[PDB]
Design an enzyme around this catalytic site. Structure first.
Site, PDB file in Angstrom:
ATOM      1  N   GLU A  82      31.062 -47.953  -8.551  1.00 33.93           N
ATOM      2  CA  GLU A  82      31.083 -47.420  -7.195  1.00 33.93           C
ATOM      3  C   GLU A  82      29.763 -47.711  -6.453  1.00 33.93           C
ATOM      4  O   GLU A  82      29.862 -48.200  -5.325  1.00 33.93           O
ATOM      5  CB  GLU A  82      31.416 -45.913  -7.196  1.00 33.93           C
ATOM      6  CG  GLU A  82      32.888 -45.610  -7.425  1.00 33.93           C
ATOM      7  CD  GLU A  82      33.194 -44.205  -7.920  1.00 33.93           C
ATOM      8  OE1 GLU A  82      32.335 -43.301  -7.789  1.00 33.93           O
ATOM      9  OE2 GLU A  82      34.297 -44.017  -8.475  1.00 33.93           O
ATOM     10  N   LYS A 105      40.749 -37.873 -12.768  1.00 31.14           N
ATOM     11  CA  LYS A 105      39.563 -38.702 -12.948  1.00 31.14           C
ATOM     12  C   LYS A 105      38.558 -38.063 -13.932  1.00 31.14           C
ATOM     13  O   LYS A 105      37.802 -38.780 -14.575  1.00 31.14           O
ATOM     14  CB  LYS A 105      38.870 -38.944 -11.583  1.00 31.14           C
ATOM     15  CG  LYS A 105      37.922 -40.156 -11.623  1.00 31.14           C
ATOM     16  CD  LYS A 105      37.499 -40.594 -10.250  1.00 31.14           C
ATOM     17  CE  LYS A 105      36.246 -41.417 -10.320  1.00 31.14           C
ATOM     18  NZ  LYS A 105      35.943 -42.077  -9.021  1.00 31.14           N
ATOM     19  N   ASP A 160      25.259 -40.705  -3.468  1.00 29.55           N
ATOM     20  CA  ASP A 160      26.698 -40.513  -3.324  1.00 29.55           C
ATOM     21  C   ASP A 160      27.151 -39.052  -3.499  1.00 29.55           C
ATOM     22  O   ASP A 160      27.380 -38.593  -4.614  1.00 29.55           O
ATOM     23  CB  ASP A 160      27.452 -41.469  -4.269  1.00 29.55           C
ATOM     24  CG  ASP A 160      28.967 -41.564  -4.062  1.00 29.55           C
ATOM     25  OD1 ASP A 160      29.545 -40.662  -3.381  1.00 29.55           O
ATOM     26  OD2 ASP A 160      29.585 -42.517  -4.604  1.00 29.55           O
ATOM     27  N   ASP A 167      39.321 -47.594  -3.943  1.00 25.80           N
ATOM     28  CA  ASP A 167      38.394 -46.539  -4.314  1.00 25.80           C
ATOM     29  C   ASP A 167      39.277 -45.420  -4.856  1.00 25.80           C
ATOM     30  O   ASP A 167      39.893 -44.694  -4.076  1.00 25.80           O
ATOM     31  CB  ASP A 167      37.546 -46.078  -3.108  1.00 25.80           C
ATOM     32  CG  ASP A 167      36.744 -44.790  -3.331  1.00 25.80           C
ATOM     33  OD1 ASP A 167      36.590 -44.367  -4.507  1.00 25.80           O
ATOM     34  OD2 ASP A 167      36.275 -44.219  -2.347  1.00 25.80           O
TER      35      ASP A 167
END
Ligand SMILES: [Mg+2]
Length: 381
Positions: free
Chosen positions: A174, A69, A198, A8
């Site tokens: 994800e 990211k 999330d 992850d």
């Protein structure tokens, strides 16, 4: 043959898992932590990754890289990139073919990195902690990405894997990794409609999936790239800055990078305590100018500080349902991913929105993505 790892690669934190002995083992780092900050720092004598990198962020803002990211597979003039750049203490310049270039000082010289080279160092660290934990070389991995990542972003993530010396067997979404973690693909015949809620440290993602004959379909995605757990922590920081001022004749701790970092870490801890208890104590000795600080914060006070944020988590949920033309009654599973989903008010709003429906929260919400990535890696190994 060696085991394959599930990674992850998160915005603020990275987590790695391995499937073995009828479970997923979440790999501990050097310090015993199950998650590692997605941070890289450059000094005159060394580079630091994760915890050691985040630990000195206060002393070295210009050369401590984080949020790679948000830059990965993107172009320099992209609106999200120019906006993000305004809140980064590190330098981001335009490279050839409009690629964002991270410029830092490293070993007494100016050094340039592509975002994938920074994520490669985080992946390299995830590989090293796995190798030490499993006592052997690890090359095979499944790496996760947000469902909204385009081809360039996925390719850049795959390249970060290659640079790190990992053979990236697959790049999975994800929310898909999270559905796999809960075995939502193995519930039987017909369509299984899943909502993944999330709420990570930096980003908020809502994804609506349909699982039919083991095939995962992303029907719709929504959220806020700038709403995360750190924003709730920041509201406590703001409260604590103002509370220190009134207790200390208008003295402003925000001018001391170390004092602000220390207080922020304690607000992260207090927020975590307030998810299980109705009160938390923020206590810091010699915080600013030798002055000790202490305040008690009720869950109710914290909820009031974050009121607007709580009003905002339902909008993406309503949006994905509208975009997929689906009634909320049709949702079979509501999966909670991210540490901030532990917040009672957050859990109560979702349950309430879904007419009392209990959510899937059993798996550690900070580890659920690595869990499904590890399951997928064992299947492909
Ligand atoms: Mg994160």
């Amino acid at each position: 043959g060696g085991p394959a790892i599930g990674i992850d690669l998160g915005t603020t934190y990275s987590c790695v898992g391995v499937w073995r002995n009828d479970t997923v083992d979440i790999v501990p780092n050097d310090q015993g932590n199950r998650t590692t900050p997605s941070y890289v720092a450059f000094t005159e004598t060394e580079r630091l990754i994760g915890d050691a990198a985040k630990n000195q962020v206060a002393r070295n803002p210009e050369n401590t890289v984080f949020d790679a990211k948000r830059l990965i597979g993107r172009k320099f003039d992209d609106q999200a990139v120019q906006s993000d750049m305004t809140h980064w203490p590190f330098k981001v310049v335009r490279g050839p073919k409009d690629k964002p270039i991270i410029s830092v000082n490293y070993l007494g010289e100016k050094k340039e990195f592509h975002a994938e080279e920074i994520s490669a160092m985080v992946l390299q660290k995830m590989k090293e902690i796995s190798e030490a934990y499993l006592g052997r070389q690890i090359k095979n991995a499944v790496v996760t990405v947000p469902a909204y990542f385009n081809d360039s972003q996925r390719q850049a993530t795959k390249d970060a894997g290659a640079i790190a010396g990992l053979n990236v067997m697959r790049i999975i979404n994800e929310p898909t990794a999270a559905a796999i973690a809960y075995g939502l693909d193995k519930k039987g015949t017909g369509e299984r409609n899943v909502l993944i809620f999330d709420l990570g440290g930096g980003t908020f993602d809502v994804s609506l999936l349909t699982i039919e004959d083991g095939i995962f379909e992303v029907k719709a995605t929504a959220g806020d790239t700038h709403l995360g757990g750190e924003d709730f922590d920041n509201r406590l920081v703001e409260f604590c800055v103002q509370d220190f001022k009134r207790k200390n004749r208008g003295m402003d701790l925000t001018t001391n990078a170390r004092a602000l970092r220390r207080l922020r870490t304690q607000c992260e801890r207090a927020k975590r305590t307030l998810s299980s208890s109705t009160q938390a104590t923020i206590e810091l000795d010699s915080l600013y100018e030798g002055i000790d600080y202490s305040v008690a914060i009720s869950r109710a006070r914290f909820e009031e500080l974050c009121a607007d944020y709580f009003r905002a988590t339902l909008a993406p949920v309503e949006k994905v349902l509208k975009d997929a033309g689906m009634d909320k009654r049709s949702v079979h599973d509501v999966v909670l991913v991210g540490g901030s989903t532990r917040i009672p008010k957050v859990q109560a709003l979702i349950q309430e929105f879904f007419n009392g429906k209990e959510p899937c929260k059993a798996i550690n919400p900070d580890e659920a993505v690595a869990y499904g990535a590890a399951v997928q890696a064992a299947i492909l190994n």
